[PDB]
Amino acid sequence: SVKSEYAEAAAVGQEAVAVFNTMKAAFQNGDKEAVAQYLARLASLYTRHEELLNRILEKARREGNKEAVTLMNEFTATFQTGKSIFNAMVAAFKNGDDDSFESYLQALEKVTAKGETLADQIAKAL
């Protein structure tokens, strides 16, 4: 069901949270080789999450589930904010700009905590 596809999507999202926090520890410790690998892993996890979210939104639309579509439109919008900040974080790592990396990192943590009530609302609406 779309609801079980959203649970699969949620888990992938939580995997990115898990890796992201491990990455943050590596960054603070100066283990740049680890950070590079974690950033690669996170790109794969975000790409997969984005795709699952789009399939869920498209299915909710085909089902006529207006409330779920409204919530998923808000949610996917926020996901594009994370994407843009994540992209700038990766660029800051490439450029050796630790100040920008720190900034973007705290931004992404706010994105995830800011949207978790909406994430839970979606589960109940699908």
Ligand X SMILES: Nc1ccc2c(c1)S(=O)(=O)C=C2
Which residues contact ligand X (rule: CB under 6 A)?
Answer: 46, 78-79, 82-83, 86, 108, 111-112
CB 101 within 8 A of CB 92: yes
- In the complex, minimum distance from the CB of residue 84 to ligand X, in angstroms, rounded to a whole number: 8
Amino acid occupying residue 109: E
CB 106 within 8 A of CB 49: no
Cα gap 17→115, rounded to integer Å: 13
- In the complex, minimum distance from the CB of residue 79 to ligand X, in angstroms, rounded to a whole number: 4
Residue closest to ligand X, measured at CB: 82
The residue among 28 and 84 lying less far from ligand X, judged by its C-beta, is 84
Count CA atoms closer than 13 A to 116's CA, side-chain side.
8
The residue among 2 and 111 lying less far from ligand X, judged by its C-beta, is 111
The residue among 86 and 93 lying less far from ligand X, judged by its C-beta, is 86
Q: What are phi and psi of 100, to 5 degrees?
A: -65, -40
The residue among 65 and 112 lying less far from ligand X, judged by its C-beta, is 112
- In the complex, minimum distance from the CB of residue 29 to ligand X, in angstroms, rounded to a whole number: 21
Q: What is the DSSP letter of 96?
A: T
- In the complex, minimum distance from the CB of residue 64 to ligand X, in angstroms, rounded to a whole number: 26
